mmCIF file of C-alpha atoms in Angstrom:
data_model
loop_
_atom_site.group_PDB
_atom_site.id
_atom_site.type_symbol
_atom_site.label_atom_id
_atom_site.label_comp_id
_atom_site.label_asym_id
_atom_site.label_seq_id
_atom_site.Cartn_x
_atom_site.Cartn_y
_atom_site.Cartn_z
ATOM 1 C CA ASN A 14 48.101 74.272 112.173
ATOM 2 C CA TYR A 15 48.388 77.679 113.835
ATOM 3 C CA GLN A 16 51.644 78.498 112.085
ATOM 4 C CA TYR A 17 50.274 78.250 108.556
ATOM 5 C CA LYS A 18 47.454 80.429 109.855
ATOM 6 C CA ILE A 19 49.965 83.117 110.868
ATOM 7 C CA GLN A 20 51.544 82.873 107.433
ATOM 8 C CA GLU A 21 48.351 83.474 105.432
ATOM 9 C CA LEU A 22 47.469 86.143 107.932
ATOM 10 C CA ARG A 23 50.643 87.936 106.870
ATOM 11 C CA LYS A 24 50.046 87.480 103.129
ATOM 12 C CA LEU A 25 46.556 88.887 103.271
ATOM 13 C CA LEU A 26 47.743 91.990 105.082
ATOM 14 C CA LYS A 27 50.186 92.506 102.251
ATOM 15 C CA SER A 28 47.686 92.137 99.407
ATOM 16 C CA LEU A 29 45.214 94.187 101.433
ATOM 17 C CA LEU A 30 47.551 97.182 101.524
ATOM 18 C CA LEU A 31 48.244 96.541 97.830
ATOM 19 C CA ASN A 32 44.587 96.693 96.776
ATOM 20 C CA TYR A 33 44.036 99.761 98.922
ATOM 21 C CA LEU A 34 47.022 101.649 97.554
ATOM 22 C CA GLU A 35 45.673 100.997 94.047
ATOM 23 C CA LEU A 36 42.085 101.950 94.903
ATOM 24 C CA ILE A 37 43.288 105.095 96.660
ATOM 25 C CA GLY A 38 45.268 106.122 93.582
ATOM 26 C CA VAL A 39 48.874 105.678 94.808
ATOM 27 C CA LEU A 40 49.423 102.782 92.404
ATOM 28 C CA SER A 41 47.911 102.376 88.949
ATOM 29 C CA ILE A 42 44.669 100.575 88.234
ATOM 30 C CA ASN A 43 42.418 101.310 85.262
ATOM 31 C CA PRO A 44 38.860 102.573 86.147
ATOM 32 C CA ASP A 45 36.788 99.466 85.274
ATOM 33 C CA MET A 46 38.705 97.701 88.045
ATOM 34 C CA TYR A 47 37.680 100.146 90.768
ATOM 35 C CA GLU A 48 35.043 97.543 91.581
ATOM 36 C CA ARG A 49 37.148 94.364 91.710
ATOM 37 C CA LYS A 50 39.335 96.329 94.105
ATOM 38 C CA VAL A 51 36.637 97.337 96.579
ATOM 39 C CA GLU A 52 35.291 93.807 96.502
ATOM 40 C CA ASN A 53 38.763 92.409 97.280
ATOM 41 C CA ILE A 54 39.317 94.875 100.080
ATOM 42 C CA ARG A 55 36.296 93.237 101.746
ATOM 43 C CA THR A 56 36.958 89.574 101.082
ATOM 44 C CA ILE A 57 40.480 89.991 102.400
ATOM 45 C CA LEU A 58 39.281 91.765 105.555
ATOM 46 C CA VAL A 59 36.748 89.035 106.260
ATOM 47 C CA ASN A 60 39.423 86.385 105.666
ATOM 48 C CA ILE A 61 41.734 88.131 108.119
ATOM 49 C CA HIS A 62 39.106 88.273 110.862
ATOM 50 C CA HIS A 63 38.162 84.616 110.338
ATOM 51 C CA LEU A 64 41.829 83.670 110.358
ATOM 52 C CA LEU A 65 42.512 85.736 113.463
ATOM 53 C CA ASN A 66 39.621 84.074 115.344
ATOM 54 C CA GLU A 67 40.780 80.570 114.519
ATOM 55 C CA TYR A 68 44.006 81.605 116.246
ATOM 56 C CA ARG A 69 42.447 82.235 119.676
ATOM 57 C CA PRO A 70 42.859 78.679 121.023
ATOM 58 C CA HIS A 71 46.600 78.975 120.405
ATOM 59 C CA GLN A 72 46.831 82.284 122.249
ATOM 60 C CA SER A 73 44.782 80.844 125.098
ATOM 61 C CA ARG A 74 47.162 77.948 125.697
ATOM 62 C CA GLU A 75 49.813 80.650 125.827
ATOM 63 C CA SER A 76 47.655 82.448 128.379
ATOM 64 C CA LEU A 77 47.752 79.261 130.435
ATOM 65 C CA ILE A 78 51.484 78.714 130.048
ATOM 66 C CA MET A 79 51.956 82.229 131.299
ATOM 67 C CA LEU A 80 49.860 81.494 134.374
ATOM 68 C CA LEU A 81 51.727 78.277 135.130
ATOM 69 C CA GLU A 82 55.093 79.918 134.651
ATOM 70 C CA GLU A 83 54.123 82.880 136.789
ATOM 71 C CA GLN A 84 53.113 80.450 139.515
ATOM 72 C CA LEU A 85 56.254 78.397 139.227
ATOM 73 C CA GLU A 86 58.412 81.496 139.578
ATOM 74 C CA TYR A 87 56.376 82.798 142.495
ATOM 75 C CA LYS A 88 56.846 79.503 144.338
ATOM 76 C CA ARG A 89 60.572 79.279 143.708
ATOM 77 C CA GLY A 90 60.517 82.781 145.081
ATOM 78 C CA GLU A 91 59.019 81.722 148.390
ATOM 79 C CA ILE A 92 61.544 78.922 148.687
ATOM 80 C CA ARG A 93 64.372 81.399 148.064
ATOM 81 C CA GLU A 94 62.815 83.831 150.492
ATOM 82 C CA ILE A 95 62.990 81.167 153.231
ATOM 83 C CA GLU A 96 66.564 80.095 152.521
ATOM 84 C CA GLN A 97 67.501 83.763 152.931
ATOM 85 C CA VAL A 98 65.971 83.938 156.390
ATOM 86 C CA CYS A 99 67.809 80.801 157.442
ATOM 87 C CA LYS A 100 71.103 82.415 156.406
ATOM 88 C CA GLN A 101 70.195 85.681 158.125
ATOM 89 C CA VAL A 102 69.460 83.700 161.280
ATOM 90 C CA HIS A 103 72.750 81.861 160.835
ATOM 91 C CA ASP A 104 74.465 85.247 160.714
ATOM 92 C CA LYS A 105 72.842 86.729 163.829
ATOM 93 C CA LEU A 106 73.901 83.480 165.464
ATOM 94 C CA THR A 107 77.433 83.088 164.102
ATOM 95 C CA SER A 108 78.782 86.551 163.235
ATOM 96 C CA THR B 2 46.349 87.039 126.125
ATOM 97 C CA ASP B 3 46.386 90.824 126.018
ATOM 98 C CA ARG B 4 48.524 91.081 122.910
ATOM 99 C CA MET B 5 46.024 88.850 121.129
ATOM 100 C CA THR B 6 43.289 91.202 122.271
ATOM 101 C CA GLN B 7 45.143 94.329 121.200
ATOM 102 C CA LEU B 8 45.572 92.654 117.830
ATOM 103 C CA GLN B 9 41.804 92.060 117.668
ATOM 104 C CA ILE B 10 40.909 95.579 118.732
ATOM 105 C CA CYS B 11 43.513 96.920 116.334
ATOM 106 C CA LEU B 12 42.217 94.935 113.374
ATOM 107 C CA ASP B 13 38.745 96.104 114.404
ATOM 108 C CA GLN B 14 39.698 99.795 114.161
ATOM 109 C CA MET B 15 41.339 99.292 110.798
ATOM 110 C CA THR B 16 38.296 97.501 109.359
ATOM 111 C CA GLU B 17 36.304 100.559 110.344
ATOM 112 C CA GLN B 18 38.787 102.951 108.790
ATOM 113 C CA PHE B 19 38.651 101.068 105.505
ATOM 114 C CA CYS B 20 34.883 101.436 105.656
ATOM 115 C CA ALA B 21 35.052 105.146 106.470
ATOM 116 C CA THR B 22 37.426 105.477 103.543
ATOM 117 C CA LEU B 23 35.535 103.316 101.040
ATOM 118 C CA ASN B 24 32.313 105.130 101.861
ATOM 119 C CA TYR B 25 33.987 108.543 101.866
ATOM 120 C CA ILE B 26 35.556 107.829 98.488
ATOM 121 C CA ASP B 27 32.693 105.935 96.866
ATOM 122 C CA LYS B 28 29.941 108.339 97.943
ATOM 123 C CA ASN B 29 31.644 111.707 97.410
ATOM 124 C CA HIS B 30 33.684 111.423 94.216
ATOM 125 C CA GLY B 31 33.460 107.903 92.787
ATOM 126 C CA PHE B 32 37.181 108.595 92.825
ATOM 127 C CA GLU B 33 36.709 110.385 89.522
ATOM 128 C CA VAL B 49 30.072 117.591 97.084
ATOM 129 C CA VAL B 50 33.402 118.519 98.719
ATOM 130 C CA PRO B 51 36.086 120.472 96.759
ATOM 131 C CA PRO B 52 39.029 118.791 94.954
ATOM 132 C CA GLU B 53 41.924 120.000 97.086
ATOM 133 C CA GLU B 54 39.738 118.958 100.029
ATOM 134 C CA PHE B 55 38.832 115.404 99.027
ATOM 135 C CA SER B 56 42.595 115.000 98.532
ATOM 136 C CA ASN B 57 43.605 116.055 102.060
ATOM 137 C CA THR B 58 41.329 113.662 103.923
ATOM 138 C CA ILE B 59 41.974 110.808 101.495
ATOM 139 C CA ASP B 60 45.653 111.093 102.447
ATOM 140 C CA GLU B 61 45.101 111.445 106.186
ATOM 141 C CA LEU B 62 42.752 108.437 105.990
ATOM 142 C CA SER B 63 45.204 106.347 104.003
ATOM 143 C CA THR B 64 48.106 107.459 106.194
ATOM 144 C CA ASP B 65 46.502 105.956 109.296
ATOM 145 C CA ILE B 66 45.744 102.785 107.353
ATOM 146 C CA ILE B 67 49.435 102.481 106.567
ATOM 147 C CA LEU B 68 50.453 102.942 110.206
ATOM 148 C CA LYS B 69 47.728 100.576 111.415
ATOM 149 C CA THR B 70 49.135 97.984 109.038
ATOM 150 C CA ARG B 71 52.549 98.398 110.615
ATOM 151 C CA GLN B 72 51.151 98.269 114.120
ATOM 152 C CA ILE B 73 49.238 95.117 113.269
ATOM 153 C CA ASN B 74 52.271 93.417 111.770
ATOM 154 C CA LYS B 75 54.248 94.249 114.929
ATOM 155 C CA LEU B 76 51.529 92.822 117.202
ATOM 156 C CA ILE B 77 51.430 89.668 115.132
ATOM 157 C CA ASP B 78 55.190 89.441 115.524
ATOM 158 C CA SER B 79 54.940 89.893 119.296
ATOM 159 C CA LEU B 80 52.222 87.291 119.768
ATOM 160 C CA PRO B 81 53.647 84.789 122.280
ATOM 161 C CA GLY B 82 54.416 81.341 120.923
ATOM 162 C CA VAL B 83 53.756 82.713 117.441
ATOM 163 C CA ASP B 84 56.383 80.404 115.931
ATOM 164 C CA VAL B 85 55.218 77.466 118.024
ATOM 165 C CA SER B 86 52.813 74.661 117.113
ATOM 166 C CA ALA B 87 50.035 73.116 119.163
ATOM 167 C CA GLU B 88 51.795 69.809 119.797
ATOM 168 C CA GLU B 89 54.528 71.773 121.550
ATOM 169 C CA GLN B 90 52.220 74.017 123.529
ATOM 170 C CA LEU B 91 50.635 70.887 124.947
ATOM 171 C CA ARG B 92 54.056 69.533 125.883
ATOM 172 C CA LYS B 93 55.122 72.727 127.598
ATOM 173 C CA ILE B 94 51.913 72.658 129.607
ATOM 174 C CA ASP B 95 52.507 69.099 130.785
ATOM 175 C CA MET B 96 56.115 69.923 131.525
ATOM 176 C CA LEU B 97 55.040 72.928 133.580
ATOM 177 C CA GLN B 98 52.442 71.006 135.550
ATOM 178 C CA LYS B 99 55.076 68.443 136.472
ATOM 179 C CA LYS B 100 57.529 71.106 137.575
ATOM 180 C CA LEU B 101 54.699 72.610 139.620
ATOM 181 C CA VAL B 102 54.134 69.411 141.575
ATOM 182 C CA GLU B 103 57.867 69.315 142.274
ATOM 183 C CA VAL B 104 58.373 72.942 143.228
ATOM 184 C CA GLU B 105 55.507 72.533 145.635
ATOM 185 C CA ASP B 106 57.055 69.436 147.185
ATOM 186 C CA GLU B 107 60.173 71.548 147.639
ATOM 187 C CA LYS B 108 58.109 74.303 149.147
ATOM 188 C CA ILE B 109 56.458 72.064 151.747
ATOM 189 C CA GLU B 110 59.902 70.815 152.775
ATOM 190 C CA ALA B 111 61.289 74.324 153.051
ATOM 191 C CA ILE B 112 58.352 75.328 155.222
ATOM 192 C CA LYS B 113 58.468 72.160 157.322
ATOM 193 C CA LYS B 114 62.088 72.959 158.203
ATOM 194 C CA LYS B 115 61.584 76.661 158.799
ATOM 195 C CA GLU B 116 58.698 75.797 161.143
ATOM 196 C CA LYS B 117 60.758 73.025 162.801
ATOM 197 C CA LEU B 118 63.456 75.585 163.555
ATOM 198 C CA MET B 119 61.061 78.229 164.792
ATOM 199 C CA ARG B 120 59.667 75.767 167.309
ATOM 200 C CA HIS B 121 63.235 75.104 168.461
ATOM 201 C CA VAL B 122 63.824 78.804 169.154
ATOM 202 C CA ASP B 123 60.411 79.250 170.763
ATOM 203 C CA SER B 124 61.432 76.403 173.053
ATOM 204 C CA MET B 125 64.649 77.977 174.270
ATOM 205 C CA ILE B 126 62.909 81.334 174.741
ATOM 206 C CA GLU B 127 59.909 80.094 176.722
ATOM 207 C CA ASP B 128 62.584 78.259 178.693
ATOM 208 C CA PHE B 129 63.652 81.811 179.565
ATOM 209 C CA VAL B 130 67.079 81.614 177.919
#
């Protein structure tokens, strides 16, 4: 389920920025926590990477679909390109 | 996909910045050798980039193609595209057949010296 994977990927980023902002002082966090923070800011990062990797297959299929579609359009292009010529000939012949 | 790669490379750079920050913080002042008003400057410039990188990453994730699409669908769209390919190529052979058929016709009249 690549969609759920994009969801959790977005939650982690949130809580990552949270934990950092605390650690870095911006938000409050009492001293004895300074550790829990740093540890979190590492578990979350690893989770993100893992999650991102698991997403590759999905983005590859997309890579394929883009190929296919590019092809398809290119072909329809050639067909169009020929129909043009026929009309141009028709002109030189009629008008 | 390139966007997927830019997202990887992006996440990579941020992971490093968090490390440069954690180790800069941790090692120098355990966050309470460099002066006070100094440790403050960098800490902000280091955390400022981390905030922008988080935005950039969220935008890339948003722009990932088929981001709101499942696998089941992707597989359908691929089968649908392969089928349309077979067709568009059948059309293409026909279009070429005819163009070529016509060209021969002209060539005929011309070699006929007319």
